[PDB]
Write an enzyme that holds these catalytic residues in place. Structure first.
Site, PDB file in Angstrom:
ATOM      1  N   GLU A 149       0.753  -1.251   0.000  1.00 36.78           N
ATOM      2  CA  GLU A 149       0.000   0.000   0.000  1.00 36.78           C
ATOM      3  C   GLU A 149       0.793   1.317   0.000  1.00 36.78           C
ATOM      4  O   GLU A 149       0.506   2.218   0.805  1.00 36.78           O
ATOM      5  CB  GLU A 149      -0.978  -0.015   1.186  1.00 36.78           C
ATOM      6  CG  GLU A 149      -1.847  -1.277   1.271  1.00 36.78           C
ATOM      7  CD  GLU A 149      -2.898  -1.208   2.378  1.00 36.78           C
ATOM      8  OE1 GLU A 149      -2.822  -0.316   3.251  1.00 36.78           O
ATOM      9  OE2 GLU A 149      -3.804  -2.062   2.388  1.00 36.78           O
ATOM     10  N   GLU A 259      -5.233 -11.078  -1.718  1.00 33.68           N
ATOM     11  CA  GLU A 259      -6.116 -11.028  -0.555  1.00 33.68           C
ATOM     12  C   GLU A 259      -7.569 -11.011  -0.964  1.00 33.68           C
ATOM     13  O   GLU A 259      -8.366 -10.236  -0.451  1.00 33.68           O
ATOM     14  CB  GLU A 259      -5.795  -9.782   0.268  1.00 33.68           C
ATOM     15  CG  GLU A 259      -4.332  -9.691   0.641  1.00 33.68           C
ATOM     16  CD  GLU A 259      -3.972  -8.376   1.283  1.00 33.68           C
ATOM     17  OE1 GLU A 259      -4.887  -7.657   1.733  1.00 33.68           O
ATOM     18  OE2 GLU A 259      -2.768  -8.063   1.341  1.00 33.68           O
TER      19      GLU A 259
END
Ligand SMILES: O[C@@H]1[C@@H](O)[C@@H](O)OC[C@H]1O
Ligand SMILES: O[C@@H]1[C@@H](O)[C@@H](O)OC[C@H]1O
Ligand SMILES: O[C@@H]1[C@@H](O)[C@@H](O)OC[C@H]1O
Ligand SMILES: [Mg+2]
Ligand SMILES: [Mg+2]
Length: 354
Positions: A149, A259
Protein backbone atom coordinates in the site's frame (compact mmCIF):
# COMPACT_ATOMS: atom_id res chain seq x y z
CA UNK A 1 -27.45 -29.14 3.52
CA UNK A 2 -24.26 -28.85 1.44
CA UNK A 3 -21.31 -31.27 1.88
CA UNK A 4 -18.14 -30.38 3.79
CA UNK A 5 -15.25 -28.73 1.97
CA UNK A 6 -13.04 -31.78 2.39
CA UNK A 7 -15.58 -33.93 0.56
CA UNK A 8 -15.64 -31.92 -2.67
CA UNK A 9 -13.18 -31.53 -5.56
CA UNK A 10 -9.91 -29.80 -4.72
CA UNK A 11 -9.70 -26.18 -5.88
CA UNK A 12 -5.92 -26.40 -6.14
CA UNK A 13 -6.21 -29.42 -8.45
CA UNK A 14 -8.95 -27.85 -10.59
CA UNK A 15 -6.66 -24.87 -11.34
CA UNK A 16 -3.23 -26.53 -11.27
CA UNK A 17 -2.71 -25.59 -14.92
CA UNK A 18 -3.52 -21.90 -14.34
CA UNK A 19 -2.29 -20.73 -10.94
CA UNK A 20 -1.98 -21.59 -7.25
CA UNK A 21 -4.96 -21.44 -4.91
CA UNK A 22 -3.93 -19.96 -1.58
CA UNK A 23 -5.29 -18.73 1.72
CA UNK A 24 -4.33 -16.30 4.50
CA UNK A 25 -3.86 -18.04 7.85
CA UNK A 26 -3.22 -17.51 11.56
CA UNK A 27 -0.93 -19.88 13.53
CA UNK A 28 -3.86 -21.34 15.48
CA UNK A 29 -5.72 -22.44 12.33
CA UNK A 30 -3.10 -24.95 11.22
CA UNK A 31 -4.86 -27.99 12.68
CA UNK A 32 -8.42 -29.20 13.19
CA UNK A 33 -10.99 -28.67 10.45
CA UNK A 34 -9.14 -25.64 9.07
CA UNK A 35 -5.94 -27.62 8.64
CA UNK A 36 -7.97 -30.34 6.95
CA UNK A 37 -9.49 -27.80 4.55
CA UNK A 38 -6.12 -26.19 3.77
CA UNK A 39 -4.38 -29.44 2.81
CA UNK A 40 -7.32 -30.55 0.70
CA UNK A 41 -7.89 -27.34 -1.29
CA UNK A 42 -4.84 -25.08 -1.26
CA UNK A 43 -1.32 -25.29 -2.59
CA UNK A 44 -0.26 -21.94 -1.17
CA UNK A 45 -0.67 -19.92 2.02
CA UNK A 46 0.23 -16.51 3.42
CA UNK A 47 0.38 -15.13 6.95
CA UNK A 48 -2.63 -12.96 7.71
CA UNK A 49 -0.66 -11.19 10.47
CA UNK A 50 2.27 -13.20 11.84
CA UNK A 51 4.71 -11.77 9.27
CA UNK A 52 3.98 -8.05 9.32
CA UNK A 53 6.78 -5.77 10.62
CA UNK A 54 5.47 -5.27 14.16
CA UNK A 55 4.90 -9.04 14.38
CA UNK A 56 8.55 -9.89 13.63
CA UNK A 57 10.59 -7.12 15.29
CA UNK A 58 8.35 -5.38 17.89
CA UNK A 59 11.51 -3.93 19.42
CA UNK A 60 14.72 -3.13 17.57
CA UNK A 61 16.89 -6.23 17.83
CA UNK A 62 14.17 -8.26 19.55
CA UNK A 63 12.71 -10.74 17.04
CA UNK A 64 9.69 -13.00 17.58
CA UNK A 65 9.45 -15.85 15.05
CA UNK A 66 7.15 -18.47 16.61
CA UNK A 67 3.97 -17.56 14.75
CA UNK A 68 5.84 -17.07 11.49
CA UNK A 69 7.92 -20.22 11.92
CA UNK A 70 4.79 -22.27 12.61
CA UNK A 71 3.26 -21.07 9.32
CA UNK A 72 6.49 -21.67 7.41
CA UNK A 73 6.68 -25.17 8.92
CA UNK A 74 3.08 -26.00 8.04
CA UNK A 75 3.71 -25.02 4.42
CA UNK A 76 6.90 -27.08 4.28
CA UNK A 77 5.35 -30.25 5.74
CA UNK A 78 2.44 -29.93 3.31
CA UNK A 79 4.43 -28.90 0.22
CA UNK A 80 2.63 -25.58 -0.32
CA UNK A 81 4.05 -22.43 -1.86
CA UNK A 82 4.44 -19.51 0.55
CA UNK A 83 3.84 -15.79 -0.03
CA UNK A 84 5.52 -13.44 2.43
CA UNK A 85 3.36 -10.62 3.80
CA UNK A 86 4.87 -8.16 4.25
CA UNK A 87 8.28 -6.42 4.45
CA UNK A 88 7.01 -2.81 4.32
CA UNK A 89 3.71 -1.20 5.37
CA UNK A 90 2.42 1.85 7.27
CA UNK A 91 0.21 -0.29 9.54
CA UNK A 92 1.23 -2.91 12.10
CA UNK A 93 4.76 -1.55 11.98
CA UNK A 94 6.65 -0.77 15.22
CA UNK A 95 7.09 2.84 16.34
CA UNK A 96 10.79 2.52 17.23
CA UNK A 97 11.45 2.57 13.47
CA UNK A 98 10.52 6.24 13.28
CA UNK A 99 12.13 7.81 16.36
CA UNK A 100 15.47 9.62 16.10
CA UNK A 101 18.56 8.79 18.15
CA UNK A 102 17.19 11.11 20.84
CA UNK A 103 13.86 9.30 20.92
CA UNK A 104 11.75 11.91 19.15
CA UNK A 105 9.52 11.43 16.09
CA UNK A 106 11.64 11.93 12.99
CA UNK A 107 8.70 13.76 11.42
CA UNK A 108 9.07 16.58 13.95
CA UNK A 109 12.69 17.25 12.94
CA UNK A 110 13.10 20.61 11.20
CA UNK A 111 16.86 20.80 10.64
CA UNK A 112 17.45 19.85 6.99
CA UNK A 113 20.76 18.24 7.92
CA UNK A 114 19.37 16.22 10.81
CA UNK A 115 16.42 15.18 8.65
CA UNK A 116 18.84 13.90 6.02
CA UNK A 117 20.47 12.04 8.89
CA UNK A 118 17.24 10.41 10.09
CA UNK A 119 16.32 9.45 6.55
CA UNK A 120 19.58 7.51 6.21
CA UNK A 121 19.05 5.95 9.63
CA UNK A 122 15.52 4.81 8.76
CA UNK A 123 16.65 3.25 5.49
CA UNK A 124 19.37 1.47 7.48
CA UNK A 125 16.82 0.12 9.96
CA UNK A 126 14.62 -0.96 7.05
CA UNK A 127 17.64 -2.61 5.44
CA UNK A 128 18.40 -4.56 8.62
CA UNK A 129 14.80 -5.69 9.05
CA UNK A 130 14.60 -7.00 5.48
CA UNK A 131 18.02 -8.65 5.70
CA UNK A 132 17.31 -10.51 8.94
CA UNK A 133 13.91 -11.68 7.67
CA UNK A 134 14.88 -12.64 4.13
CA UNK A 135 17.86 -14.66 5.35
CA UNK A 136 15.68 -16.66 7.71
CA UNK A 137 13.02 -17.47 5.08
CA UNK A 138 14.66 -17.09 1.65
CA UNK A 139 14.38 -20.83 1.00
CA UNK A 140 10.69 -21.11 1.92
CA UNK A 141 9.04 -17.98 0.52
CA UNK A 142 7.94 -18.25 -3.12
CA UNK A 143 6.65 -14.66 -3.47
CA UNK A 144 7.48 -11.53 -1.48
CA UNK A 145 5.19 -8.57 -0.82
CA UNK A 146 8.18 -6.24 -0.64
CA UNK A 147 5.99 -3.17 -0.09
CA UNK A 148 2.33 -2.91 0.79
CA UNK A 149 0.00 0.00 0.00
CA UNK A 150 2.55 2.67 -0.99
CA UNK A 151 0.22 4.25 -3.59
CA UNK A 152 -2.43 6.73 -2.39
CA UNK A 153 -6.18 6.52 -2.95
CA UNK A 154 -6.27 10.12 -4.14
CA UNK A 155 -3.67 12.54 -5.49
CA UNK A 156 -1.92 14.32 -2.57
CA UNK A 157 1.13 14.69 -4.83
CA UNK A 158 1.70 14.46 -8.60
CA UNK A 159 2.97 10.88 -8.20
CA UNK A 160 0.06 9.62 -6.10
CA UNK A 161 2.34 8.20 -3.43
CA UNK A 162 0.78 7.50 -0.02
CA UNK A 163 2.15 10.10 2.34
CA UNK A 164 2.80 7.81 5.29
CA UNK A 165 5.64 8.25 7.78
CA UNK A 166 7.77 6.27 5.28
CA UNK A 167 7.19 8.90 2.58
CA UNK A 168 7.46 11.96 4.81
CA UNK A 169 10.91 10.82 5.82
CA UNK A 170 12.36 9.15 2.75
CA UNK A 171 10.16 10.11 -0.17
CA UNK A 172 10.06 7.12 -2.50
CA UNK A 173 13.46 5.96 -1.27
CA UNK A 174 12.16 3.38 1.19
CA UNK A 175 10.50 1.66 -1.78
CA UNK A 176 13.78 1.46 -3.71
CA UNK A 177 15.74 0.21 -0.71
CA UNK A 178 13.15 -2.45 0.12
CA UNK A 179 13.16 -4.00 -3.35
CA UNK A 180 16.94 -3.83 -3.71
CA UNK A 181 17.61 -5.21 -0.23
CA UNK A 182 15.04 -7.93 -0.96
CA UNK A 183 16.71 -8.83 -4.26
CA UNK A 184 20.13 -8.76 -2.59
CA UNK A 185 19.39 -11.29 0.15
CA UNK A 186 16.72 -13.42 -1.56
CA UNK A 187 18.61 -14.22 -4.75
CA UNK A 188 18.05 -13.21 -8.36
CA UNK A 189 15.28 -15.80 -8.63
CA UNK A 190 13.08 -14.57 -5.76
CA UNK A 191 9.78 -13.04 -6.91
CA UNK A 192 9.38 -9.50 -5.58
CA UNK A 193 5.95 -7.86 -5.57
CA UNK A 194 4.44 -4.46 -4.85
CA UNK A 195 1.01 -5.09 -3.28
CA UNK A 196 -2.04 -2.79 -3.01
CA UNK A 197 -5.85 -2.58 -3.13
CA UNK A 198 -8.07 -0.87 -5.71
CA UNK A 199 -5.45 -1.57 -8.36
CA UNK A 200 -8.29 -1.83 -10.87
CA UNK A 201 -9.59 1.72 -10.58
CA UNK A 202 -8.22 5.06 -11.76
CA UNK A 203 -6.46 7.20 -10.69
CA UNK A 204 -4.78 4.78 -8.24
CA UNK A 205 -4.21 2.19 -10.95
CA UNK A 206 -2.44 4.72 -13.16
CA UNK A 207 -0.32 6.06 -10.29
CA UNK A 208 0.81 2.52 -9.51
CA UNK A 209 1.42 1.90 -13.22
CA UNK A 210 3.65 5.02 -13.41
CA UNK A 211 5.50 4.17 -10.19
CA UNK A 212 6.53 0.68 -11.29
CA UNK A 213 7.36 2.03 -14.74
CA UNK A 214 9.52 4.75 -13.20
CA UNK A 215 11.19 2.35 -10.76
CA UNK A 216 11.77 -0.23 -13.49
CA UNK A 217 13.52 2.42 -15.57
CA UNK A 218 15.83 3.07 -12.60
CA UNK A 219 16.77 -0.59 -12.37
CA UNK A 220 14.68 -1.29 -9.26
CA UNK A 221 14.04 -5.06 -9.00
CA UNK A 222 10.27 -5.51 -9.23
CA UNK A 223 8.85 -8.75 -10.60
CA UNK A 224 5.12 -8.42 -10.16
CA UNK A 225 2.08 -6.56 -8.93
CA UNK A 226 -0.07 -7.96 -6.15
CA UNK A 227 -3.76 -7.11 -6.42
CA UNK A 228 -5.35 -7.50 -2.98
CA UNK A 229 -8.75 -7.71 -4.65
CA UNK A 230 -10.87 -6.72 -1.65
CA UNK A 231 -13.75 -6.39 -4.03
CA UNK A 232 -17.52 -6.43 -4.00
CA UNK A 233 -20.22 -8.26 -5.96
CA UNK A 234 -20.68 -5.58 -8.65
CA UNK A 235 -17.44 -3.61 -8.23
CA UNK A 236 -14.90 -3.35 -9.69
CA UNK A 237 -16.07 -4.60 -13.08
CA UNK A 238 -14.60 -7.60 -14.85
CA UNK A 239 -13.32 -5.32 -17.61
CA UNK A 240 -11.56 -3.06 -15.08
CA UNK A 241 -9.95 -6.06 -13.40
CA UNK A 242 -8.88 -7.39 -16.81
CA UNK A 243 -7.52 -4.04 -18.02
CA UNK A 244 -5.40 -3.60 -14.92
CA UNK A 245 -3.80 -7.04 -15.16
CA UNK A 246 -3.26 -6.66 -18.90
CA UNK A 247 -1.61 -3.30 -18.20
CA UNK A 248 0.97 -4.69 -15.78
CA UNK A 249 1.51 -7.82 -17.85
CA UNK A 250 2.36 -5.37 -20.59
CA UNK A 251 5.28 -4.12 -18.52
CA UNK A 252 6.54 -7.67 -18.27
CA UNK A 253 5.34 -8.10 -14.70
CA UNK A 254 3.56 -11.07 -13.17
CA UNK A 255 0.15 -10.62 -11.52
CA UNK A 256 -1.16 -12.31 -8.38
CA UNK A 257 -4.45 -11.95 -6.53
CA UNK A 258 -3.25 -11.80 -2.93
CA UNK A 259 -6.12 -11.03 -0.55
CA UNK A 260 -9.26 -11.97 -2.39
CA UNK A 261 -12.63 -11.66 -0.72
CA UNK A 262 -16.02 -10.91 -2.19
CA UNK A 263 -18.00 -8.86 0.30
CA UNK A 264 -21.79 -9.05 0.24
CA UNK A 265 -21.91 -5.30 0.79
CA UNK A 266 -20.77 -2.13 -0.91
CA UNK A 267 -18.60 0.51 0.77
CA UNK A 268 -18.92 1.38 3.45
CA UNK A 269 -20.54 -2.00 4.29
CA UNK A 270 -23.95 -0.63 5.32
CA UNK A 271 -26.40 -1.92 6.16
CA UNK A 272 -24.88 -5.25 7.12
CA UNK A 273 -26.89 -8.28 8.16
CA UNK A 274 -26.58 -8.77 11.96
CA UNK A 275 -25.91 -12.51 11.89
CA UNK A 276 -24.93 -15.13 9.35
CA UNK A 277 -28.35 -16.79 9.44
CA UNK A 278 -29.97 -13.45 8.59
CA UNK A 279 -28.25 -13.37 5.18
CA UNK A 280 -30.73 -14.19 2.36
CA UNK A 281 -29.90 -16.80 -0.27
CA UNK A 282 -30.31 -14.24 -3.04
CA UNK A 283 -27.10 -12.64 -1.73
CA UNK A 284 -25.13 -15.87 -1.88
CA UNK A 285 -26.52 -16.53 -5.36
CA UNK A 286 -25.47 -13.08 -6.49
CA UNK A 287 -22.07 -13.79 -4.93
CA UNK A 288 -21.95 -17.06 -6.85
CA UNK A 289 -22.51 -15.36 -10.24
CA UNK A 290 -19.75 -12.92 -9.31
CA UNK A 291 -17.33 -15.71 -8.45
CA UNK A 292 -18.05 -17.59 -11.66
CA UNK A 293 -17.29 -14.51 -13.73
CA UNK A 294 -14.24 -13.76 -11.64
CA UNK A 295 -12.58 -17.15 -12.01
CA UNK A 296 -13.56 -17.40 -15.66
CA UNK A 297 -11.59 -14.17 -16.04
CA UNK A 298 -8.63 -15.38 -13.98
CA UNK A 299 -8.65 -18.48 -16.14
CA UNK A 300 -8.76 -16.39 -19.31
CA UNK A 301 -5.66 -14.56 -18.07
CA UNK A 302 -3.80 -17.51 -16.52
CA UNK A 303 -0.88 -16.69 -18.81
CA UNK A 304 -0.15 -13.58 -16.73
CA UNK A 305 -1.64 -14.69 -13.40
CA UNK A 306 0.40 -17.06 -11.27
CA UNK A 307 -1.44 -17.22 -7.98
CA UNK A 308 -4.81 -16.46 -6.44
CA UNK A 309 -5.09 -16.22 -2.67
CA UNK A 310 -8.22 -15.70 -0.59
CA UNK A 311 -7.77 -13.53 2.53
CA UNK A 312 -9.05 -16.37 4.69
CA UNK A 313 -10.42 -19.91 4.57
CA UNK A 314 -14.09 -20.06 5.56
CA UNK A 315 -16.78 -17.49 6.46
CA UNK A 316 -16.22 -18.05 10.18
CA UNK A 317 -12.98 -16.00 10.11
CA UNK A 318 -12.79 -12.82 8.00
CA UNK A 319 -11.51 -9.30 8.67
CA UNK A 320 -14.54 -8.11 6.73
CA UNK A 321 -16.56 -8.69 9.89
CA UNK A 322 -14.56 -6.02 11.71
CA UNK A 323 -15.30 -3.63 8.86
CA UNK A 324 -18.97 -4.58 8.95
CA UNK A 325 -19.12 -3.94 12.71
CA UNK A 326 -17.36 -0.56 12.55
CA UNK A 327 -20.05 0.77 10.23
CA UNK A 328 -23.08 -0.95 11.77
CA UNK A 329 -22.90 0.07 15.43
CA UNK A 330 -20.83 -2.92 16.49
CA UNK A 331 -22.97 -5.61 14.89
CA UNK A 332 -22.55 -7.15 11.46
CA UNK A 333 -21.50 -10.27 9.57
CA UNK A 334 -20.05 -10.74 6.10
CA UNK A 335 -19.51 -14.02 4.15
CA UNK A 336 -16.80 -13.60 1.43
CA UNK A 337 -15.63 -17.15 0.76
CA UNK A 338 -16.79 -20.31 -1.01
CA UNK A 339 -16.97 -22.12 2.34
CA UNK A 340 -19.49 -21.16 5.05
CA UNK A 341 -18.85 -20.87 8.85
CA UNK A 342 -19.21 -24.62 9.22
CA UNK A 343 -16.87 -25.46 6.35
CA UNK A 344 -19.73 -26.52 4.09
CA UNK A 345 -19.49 -25.48 0.46
CA UNK A 346 -21.53 -22.49 -0.74
CA UNK A 347 -23.28 -21.81 -4.07
CA UNK A 348 -20.07 -20.06 -5.08
CA UNK A 349 -17.92 -23.17 -4.73
CA UNK A 350 -19.82 -25.15 -7.36
CA UNK A 351 -19.66 -22.19 -9.79
CA UNK A 352 -15.86 -22.06 -9.71
CA UNK A 353 -15.15 -25.80 -9.51
CA UNK A 354 -16.95 -26.66 -12.75
O1 LIG B 1 -12.06 -1.06 0.16
C1 LIG B 1 -11.90 0.09 0.96
C2 LIG B 1 -10.49 0.12 1.58
O2 LIG B 1 -10.48 -0.70 2.68
C3 LIG B 1 -10.01 1.50 1.97
O3 LIG B 1 -9.70 1.57 3.32
O4 LIG B 1 -10.95 2.46 1.69
C4 LIG B 1 -11.28 2.44 0.35
C5 LIG B 1 -12.26 1.33 0.12
O1 LIG C 1 -12.49 3.50 -2.80
C1 LIG C 1 -13.41 2.42 -2.95
C2 LIG C 1 -14.79 2.95 -3.31
O2 LIG C 1 -14.69 3.74 -4.49
C3 LIG C 1 -15.81 1.76 -3.43
O3 LIG C 1 -16.42 1.70 -4.65
O4 LIG C 1 -15.19 0.52 -3.18
C4 LIG C 1 -14.53 0.45 -1.94
C5 LIG C 1 -13.54 1.56 -1.70
O5 LIG C 1 -12.36 1.04 -1.25
O1 LIG D 1 -8.81 -11.68 11.40
C1 LIG D 1 -7.83 -11.37 12.31
C2 LIG D 1 -8.16 -12.01 13.74
O2 LIG D 1 -6.97 -12.55 14.23
C3 LIG D 1 -8.83 -11.00 14.76
O3 LIG D 1 -8.10 -10.86 15.94
O4 LIG D 1 -9.02 -9.69 14.22
C4 LIG D 1 -7.82 -9.25 13.73
C5 LIG D 1 -7.65 -9.82 12.33
O5 LIG D 1 -6.41 -9.43 11.83
MG1 LIG E 1 -0.20 -18.95 -14.58
MG1 LIG F 1 -17.62 -21.54 -13.37
Amino acid sequence: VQPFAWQVASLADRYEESFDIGAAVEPHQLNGRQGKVLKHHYNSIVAENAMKPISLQPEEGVFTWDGADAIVEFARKNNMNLRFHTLVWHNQVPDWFFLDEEGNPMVEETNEAKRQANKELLLERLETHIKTVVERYKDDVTAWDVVNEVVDDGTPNERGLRESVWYQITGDEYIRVAFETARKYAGEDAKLFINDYNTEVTPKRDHLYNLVQDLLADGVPIDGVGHQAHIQIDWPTIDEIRTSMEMFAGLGLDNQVTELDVSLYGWPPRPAFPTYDAIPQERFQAQADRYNQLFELYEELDADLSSVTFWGIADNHTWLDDRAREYNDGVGKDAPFVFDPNYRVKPAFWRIID
